[PDB]
C-alpha cells in the first residue's frame, strides 16, 4: 500500500487514546484530592533516505495538573486540605513512601490513621492515635487527642503530620494514583522529602478534583473533528490504491 | 528503464503520493505541542519542479525538497507549560485544516488521472505491438 | 468497551451512585437520630502504555 494510511491510522488511534485519558479525567470529577492528567500530541518524524515526508503522531501525558481544586466545607475535624504546592505523605502499597492531596483521614478501631486505606506518615513513621479518641488537627499539622470521659483539659499533642513541598515538574503519578519523586528530582532532593515547616493545612475542608470542564469539552470536540479528518484520508488512500492496482493489469 | 510516458506518469504518481503523505502528516499533527527536541511542529509542504532533464520543459513532476512553512507559529497562553517562552506563550502549528483536506482531495484526483493516463498509454502500445497483425 | 465508552460509563455510574446517596440523605430528613451519608470516590489503577 501507500503507507500514508498508516499515518492517518496512527493519528486516529492516538486520538482515541487522548479521548480515553479525557474520559478518565471526567469520571473523576468528584474524586477528593484528584490531579487531572495532561494529554498532548507529539510528532515523531521518521528518519531515513529521501524526502522526509512522513511524521507520525503519538499521544503523551506530560505529568499532571497541580492547580488546587475546590475546597468543600465539611464540618469534620479529620478532613484537612493542604496549602497550594503542598502534599501529605502516606505509606504506599509496597511499603514505600508516597504523596497525596486527599485529606479524608480515617481512624481505625485500633487507632491508626489512614488515607484511602494507606497508613498516614507522621513525623516518625505511621501515626497511631489513642483508641476511640477525638482528634483535632492544627494549622501546621500537630494532632491533639481528647480521650472521651476525661475533661477537655486532657487535650495534648500526639504527633505531627508530615507535609512536604513539591512542584509538578518533580513528581510523577505511579500506577496506583500516588505521586512519587521523579528520578532527576529524587537524585537532587534525596530519597525522602524533608518536611517543610512553612506548609499550612486547613482542618474541616476537603479538596476536590481540579478537572476543568471547559477544557475537557473543547478537547472532546477537537478530538472528534480530528478523528473524522484522519478518517477522510484513510478513505482517500483506500480508493487511490484500489485504482492504482489497475496499472498491474495487461 | 522506464520509457517516455511511463516515466512521466510514474514521476507524477510518486510526487502526488508524496504530496498526499505530507498533507496527511500536516493534518495528523495539527495539534501537536512539541517535537522530539522541544521545537514545535512546523507545517511541511512539497516543492514541485519539472523533470526537464536538460533541454525539454516537457517532463513529469519531481519533488525538489520538502520545505517547512516559515509563517509565524500560532501562539497560545500557557505559563505553566515548560515550553513557554519568557512571555508565557507556547508555539502551536500553523496548519490550515481546510487547506490540508483540499490538498488531499487534489492529490487523490491527480493520482487517479495519471493512473488513467498510464493505463491508456499501456493499452495503446500493447496494441502497437501487433502492427500489421 | 473501546476504553472510552467504558471510562465514561464508569463515571456515569459513579455520579448515579452519588445521586442515590444524596436522595437517601434527603428522604431521611425527618427520621430521628439519622447520620448523613457522604460518598467517597477513588480512581482505579492507571495503565502505563510507554515509559518516560
Amino acid at each position: 500500500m501507500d503507507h500514508a494510511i498508516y499515518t492517518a491510522m496512527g493519528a486516529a488511534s492516538q486520538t482515541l487514546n487522548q479521548q480515553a485519558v479525557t474520559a478518565s479525567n471526567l469520571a473523576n470529577a468528584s474524586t477528593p484530592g484528584f490531579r487531572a492528567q495532561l494529554n498532548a500530541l507529539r510528532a515523531v518524524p521518521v528518519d531515513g533516505l529521501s524526502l522526509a515526508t512522513r511524521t507520525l503522531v503519538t499521544a503523551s501525558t506530560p505529568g499532571a495538573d497541580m492547580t488546587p481544586g475546590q475546597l468543600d466545607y465539611t464540618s469534620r475535624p479529620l478532613d484537612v486540605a493542604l496549602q497550594q504546592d503542598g502534599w501529605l505523605v502516606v505509606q504506599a502499597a509496597d511499603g514505600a513512601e508516597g504523596y497525596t492531596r486527599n485529606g479524608n483521614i480515617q481512624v481505625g478501631p485500633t487507632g491508626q490513621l489512614t488515607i484511602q486505606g494507606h497508613p498516614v506518615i507522621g513525623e516518625g513513621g505511621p501515626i497511631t492515635v489513642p483508641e476511640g479518641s477525638e482528634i483535632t488537627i492544627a494549622a501546621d499539622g500537630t494532632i491533639s487527642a481528647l480521650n472521651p470521659g476525661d475533661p477537655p483539659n486532657t487535650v495534648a499533642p500526639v504527633g505531627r503530620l508530615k507535609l512536604v513541598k513539591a512542584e509538578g515538574n518533580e513528581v510523577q503519578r505511579s500506577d496506583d494514583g500516588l505521586f512519587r519523586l521523579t528520578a532527576e528530582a529524587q537524585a537532587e532532593r534525596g530519597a525522602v522529602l524533608a518536611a517543610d515547616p512553612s506548609i499550612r493545612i486547613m482542618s474541616g475542608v476537603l479538596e476536590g478534583s481540579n478537572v476543568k470542564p471547559v477544557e475537557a469539552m473543547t478537547d472532546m470536540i477537537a478530538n472528534a473533528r480530528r478523528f473524522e479528518m484522519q478518517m477522510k484520508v484513510i478513505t482517500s488512500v483506500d480508493e487511490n490504491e484500489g485504482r492504482a492496482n489497475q496499472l498491474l493489469s495487461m | 528503464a522506464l520509457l517516455n510516458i511511463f516515466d512521466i506518469a510514474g514521476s507524477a504518481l510518486a510526487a502526488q503520493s508524496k504530496r498526499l503523505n505530507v498533507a496527511a502528516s500536516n493534518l495528523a499533527n495539527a495539534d501537536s505541542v512539541t517535537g522530539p527536541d522541544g521545537q514545535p511542529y512546523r507545517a511541511k509542504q512539497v516543492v514541485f519542479q519539472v523533470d526537464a532533464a536538460p533541454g525539454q520543459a516537457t517532463g513529469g513532476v519531481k519533488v525538489a525538497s520538502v520545505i517547512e512553512s516559515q509563517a509565524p507559529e500560532k501562539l497560545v497562553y500557557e505559563p505553566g507549560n515548560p515550553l513557554a517562552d519568557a512571555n508565557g506563550y507556547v508555539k502551536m502549528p500553523n496548519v490550515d485544516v481546510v487547506g490540508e483536506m483540499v490538498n488531499t482531495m487534489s492529490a487523490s484526483r491527480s493520482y487517479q488521472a495519471n493512473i488513467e493516463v498510464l493505463n491508456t498509454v499501456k493499452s495503446m502500445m500493447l496494441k502497437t505491438l501487433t502492427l500489421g497483425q | 468497551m473501546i476504553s472510552s465508552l467504558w471510562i465514561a460509563k464508569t463515571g456515569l455510574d459513579a455520579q448515579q451512585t452519588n445521586m442515590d446517596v444524596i436522595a437517601n440523605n434527603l428522604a431521611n430528613v425527618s427520621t430521628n437520630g439519622f447520620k448523613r451519608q457522604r460518598a467517597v470516590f477513588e480512581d482505579l489503577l492507571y495503565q502505563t502504555i510507554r515509559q518516560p
Binding site: 515523531v44 518524524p45 529521501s50 | 510514474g10 522530539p36 | -
Partner: peptide
C-alpha cells in the same frame, strides 16, 4: 541518489525516536 533509482548500497535503518536523547 534520486528517489526511485538504483544504488550500490542499502538504505540506512529506519527509526522513529519518541524522545531524543
Amino acid at each position: 541518489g534520486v528517489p526511485g533509482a538504483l544504488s550500490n548500497q542499502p538504505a540506512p535503518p529506519n527509526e522513529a525516536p519518541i524522545a531524543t536523547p
